[PDB]
Amino acid sequence: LYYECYSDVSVHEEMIADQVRTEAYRLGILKNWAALRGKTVLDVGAGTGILSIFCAQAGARRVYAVEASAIWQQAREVVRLNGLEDRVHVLPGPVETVELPERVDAIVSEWMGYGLLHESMLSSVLHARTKWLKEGGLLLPASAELFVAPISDQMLEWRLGFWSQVKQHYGVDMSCMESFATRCLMGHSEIVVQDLSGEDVLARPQRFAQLELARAGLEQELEAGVGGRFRCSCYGSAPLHGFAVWFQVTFPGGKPLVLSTSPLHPATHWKQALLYLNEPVPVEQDTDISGEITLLPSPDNPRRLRILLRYKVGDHEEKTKDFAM
């Protein structure tokens, strides 16, 4: 028979094969063994069930693994195979309408999306916190931080400069194609998910927001926009292509464990969210860059990430660019 689930298995494979992500959760959950031992846990968006199993292995007495997508059936099988059907219960459907037989001592979730908030489960985690978490209960991870840095994307630089190099390899001048490539690769307002490295970072990364997931008011902040101002000074001479946005989340130490998606840290499946200017801007050592960045819902869809960027490079006028996934 033929099936249409290629994309489903690929997404879950990618996440479990992301050792930085999956080991951070394994260890972050285990670091909280004292708080989980003999207690009940809700896993929001449990996927294949692996995190729910990690919670049982950390000593949870009972775990409710809630998953709305088709993969919930595989999670139930995984739980059975690990001998945990008596303690880990897979419940299909969205957490907003699931019926648990009790409130829980902790919520665990891998809820983060590209750019932190694209197609994230954060609103579901917060809904579950309000509805099902006992007073004083634990959230894992507990917090998130957002970072921005100006970038000179070496891969993009190569793509833009490719056309001017055709002559040296094939004896045909194609340098005129550079303007075309620039318009096409940079003159749009889409957020681009791409992995960078430290070599691409043009100034010290700046933290522009911190989200304490248990804090009052966070749901309203998400609707109004999460963001802040930033300022920095460039390391050296390079074409500025725009900005990269990334995040980290923190698991309480029960030394806290941080799962980072920085280009300076080991690669993850989240990569970074890139915000390209319409064309490169030359900068030099100590060129000042300032601005404001805000992560917003889209009008049609609160889970489609919009980023509004205001930026000022050196003595140039401040500019605005409104991006979306």
Place this chain on the structure above:
Amino acid sequence: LYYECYSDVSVHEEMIADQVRTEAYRLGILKNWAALRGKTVLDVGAGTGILSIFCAQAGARRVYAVEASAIWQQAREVVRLNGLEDRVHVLPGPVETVELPERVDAIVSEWMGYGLLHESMLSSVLHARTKWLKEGGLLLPASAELFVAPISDQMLEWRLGFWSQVKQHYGVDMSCMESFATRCLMGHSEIVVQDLSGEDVLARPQRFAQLELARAGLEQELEAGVGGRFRCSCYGSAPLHGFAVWFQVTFPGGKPLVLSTSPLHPATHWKQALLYLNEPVPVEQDTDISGEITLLPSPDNPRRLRILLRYKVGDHEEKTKDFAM
């Protein structure tokens, strides 16, 4: 301003950055300098114009570069930048309805698609041959050959076996997910474009068709299906995942120059076209495999590639699988 041409520049960049392809054309055209010198050329689907310029550099007196996509405007600029506006003429629109002021001595084209015939320009090249090529005129390349081999795709093997290895890395058994991954990754009827290497090839590749582009009847063969029978014997013990299809084209020697897309040869942007069985089949040294493969138009769209596969592995019954891009 914002533009929507990211995909356009990416496709042309990929093709020109494919040195195996682009150098094969450069050299194949130059190898035919005696036949091109002082003569006229039609370039079918000229793209950015680079091949038309190669023809002028080989000594063509005049080149008509026909291109229907938006990129024709860039080609005109490239021609001007290389000082060739007097000799290379860019004509927008499909070659089927272009008006040339003369018949031509040669047609050059990079017309090949994935699996040779997916979204290929072959029918346009043949239409132009009939309408515009002088009797006795030259086609570059002159011929194509199609190959098939059984494969044990090492990357696929890793993806399928991933689930059974989760326990050894995270201490959670996910071996039950293997059946799910198999159905999802192999239990469909889509042709998959993927690059393999010699390590993936399970028996001697077999040539199953040869197309002489000037030959009478080729248009009718394309409609009825291009293909043939094959037989081979496996090198060793491995999971058979299916078959790979690839091609080469040949430029007359003016030693002919061959541009190959074999997994045993340097990588190209065409990769190979993979035809997966619904599930792996164990084979051993000297396991006989035979079958028939036919490349066909789709009902809705003659340029959407269909491949009909009949295959018999060892003593198993012959099976059929009908694939499409």
